[PDB]
């Protein structure tokens, strides 16, 4: 082993670091938002179909609970 | 003191000359050669250092003046 060979290593090993690192955060908000917006949108048809049909606006709850024929 | 006390110092003190006195100016040369040698060697790590780090080999100097970030 000689010094020349651990300086280079040394050198790479520092050049190797001082990778830029974007931010990231923004993309996982983003996706965050998204997510949500397609969780929530199917439930507009649910509401306007059992408003449609005349179940009363107090009865569409959330759940897995079976839906009856008042209830939604 | 007799005579052949005298003539036997002398004929030791001839014996005790005579002695051959090898080459030795080629062991100092050498070894003045492995000195430079070993001198000069470490500064090839200096060099190369400097150099991968970005040092412009202009500034790769010869003193102990203290390096800085862009001098060497």
Not at 16 to 24: M, R, S, V
Not at 30 to 39: I, P, Q
Not at 41 to 70: D, F, H, Q
Request: proline content about 3%; hydrophobic content about 45%; aromatic content about 4%.
């Amino acid at each position: 082993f000689t010094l020349i060979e651990l300086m280079i290593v040394v050198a790479i090993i520092g050049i190797l670091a001082a990778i830029a690192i974007p931010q990231y955060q923004n993309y996982v908000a983003r996706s965050e938002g998204a997510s949500a917006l397609a969780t929530i949108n199917p439930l507009k048809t649910t509401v306007e179909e059992s408003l449609s049909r005349g179940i009363a606006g107090s009865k569409i709850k959330i759940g897995t609970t079976a839906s009856t024929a008042t209830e939604t």
